[PDB]
Design a protein around this ligand. Structure first.
Ligand SMILES: *[C@@H](O)c1ccccc1N
Ligand SMILES: [Ca+2]
Ligand SMILES: [Ca+2]
Ligand SMILES: [Cl-]
Ligand SMILES: [Cl-]
Ligand SMILES: [Cu+]
Ligand SMILES: [Mg+2]
Ligand SMILES: [Mg+2]
Ligand SMILES: [Mg+2]
Ligand SMILES: [Mg+2]
Lengths: 302, 14
């Protein structure tokens, strides 16, 4: 937890819980066993995990909500402090300069000076037509800052995954095992040929409003696709392979690490590249980093 | 060829 220069407004439990669903205490099977999963992701093993009851946001935190936080606190995000953030190449306007540097493994990501949550494609862009889209260009530090100010916290990975699974046992996606059941789109991911052309068959070639598509069985929206969502846990591909109370009862993840867990996949994910919009999928990013496809939702103790 | 990258980090560019 970093240092914060704001204070926390007094709020009633009903105000905090608005927009949240109450997940009952219980067990669930976390993890996955897809043979094509990338070993370095540590999706396995599948294990029974017991969680205490918690609340979780039905929606990722929106631009309008993050703007309220910034209005109240003057909070300055990491992307503003560093002066740049990651934007998908095809979304940068031609007259907007970018840094000449490349992400070796993912050259479709460009570092854009001046890209941040209120200007998500760089200077000249805005969020005036996206108030109910998930806030992006928020680092893990920014996410924990908002959640703290909001009277909440980030979910653990296990809380995130229990809620995202929506009461189904070991299904592939939040809603079941078929990606487009009866040909209906259920999430905002990539269609077409990644990274060359997104056909937008699901309606969106960038972020969608936080209430797009149907909820899962617990009432959560866009747990799969739309934006990656920061979780509290440090990233490890093996800590959770241990079988102990620490890893199976309200697991908090490893005590140390270098990157924090992100869940759920994004509008950029595709079967032919990452296949990371399955509910067991997982990756990470370093806590000071920010990108146009990464946001968060909050959780809270009851 | 290597594990796909979905989360671009500042370190990838530094
Ligand atoms: C390399 O191994 C690679 C490259 C692109 C997509 C998937 C994989 N596994
Ligand atoms: Ca899409
Ligand atoms: Ca998501
Ligand atoms: Cl909107
Ligand atoms: Cl799976
Ligand atoms: Cu992905
Ligand atoms: Mg103070
Ligand atoms: Mg609220
Ligand atoms: Mg806290
Ligand atoms: Mg595959």
């Amino acid at each position: 937890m970093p240092s914060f220069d704001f204070d926390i407004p007094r709020r009633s439990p009903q105000e905090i819980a608005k927009g949240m669903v109450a997940i009952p205490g219980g067990t669930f099977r976390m993890g996955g066993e897809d043979p094509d999963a990338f070993p370095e992701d540590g999706e396995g093993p599948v294990r029974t995990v017991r969680l205490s009851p918690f609340l979780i946001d039905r929606y990722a935190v929106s631009n309008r909500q993050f703007a309220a936080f910034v209005k109240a606190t003057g909070y300055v995000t990491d992307a503003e402090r560093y002066g740049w953030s990651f934007v998908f190449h095809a979304h940068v306007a031609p007259g907007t300069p970018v840094m000449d540097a490349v992400v070796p493994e993912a050259p479709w990501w460009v570092a854009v000076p001046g890209a941040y949550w209120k200007a998500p494609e760089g200077p000249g862009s805005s969020i005036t037509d996206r108030p109910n889209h998930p806030v992006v260009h928020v680092s893990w530090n920014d996410a924990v800052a908002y959640a703290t100010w909001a009277g909440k916290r980030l979910p653990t990975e296990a809380e995130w995954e229990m809620a995202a699974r929506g009461g189904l046992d070991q299904a592939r996606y939040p809603w079941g095992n078929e990606l487009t059941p009866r040909g209906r789109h259920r999430c905002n991911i990539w269609q077409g040929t990644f990274p060359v052309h997104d056909t937008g068959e699901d309606g969106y070639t960038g972020t969608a409003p936080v209430n797009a598509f149907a909820p899962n069985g617990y009432g959560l929206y866009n747990v799969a696709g739309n934006v990656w969502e920061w979780c509290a846990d440090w990233w490890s591909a093996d800590w959770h392979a241990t079988e102990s109370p620490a890893t199976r009862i309200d697991p908090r993840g490893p005590e140390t690490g270098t990157a924090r867990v992100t869940k759920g996949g994004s509008f950029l994910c595709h079967e032919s590249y990452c296949n990371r919009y399955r509910v067991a999928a997982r990756t990470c990013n370093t806590p000071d980093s920010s990108a146009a496809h990464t946001g968060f939702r909050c959780a809270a103790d009851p | 060829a290597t594990t796909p990258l979905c989360g671009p980090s500042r370190a990838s560019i530094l």
